[PDB]
């Protein structure tokens, strides 16, 4: 999975 997607999933 995309690290930059992960970095938003984090807040979501």
Q: How was this structure determined?
A: NMR
Cα 5 off chain centre by: 3
- Residue 9 token pair: 């999933």
Q: In angstroms, rounded to a whole number, what is the distance separating the alpha carbons of residues 1 and 9?
A: 11
Instruction: Kindly report the number of other CB atoms within 10 A of residue 11's CB atom.
Output: 5
Q: How many helices (H) and strands (E) does the chain have?
A: 1, 0
Compute CA distances 7 → 11, 12, whole Å: 7, 9
Quote the Cα angle for 12-2-10, to 5°: 20
């Amino acid at each position: 999975l995309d690290a930059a997607l992960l970095a938003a999933a984090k807040a979501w």
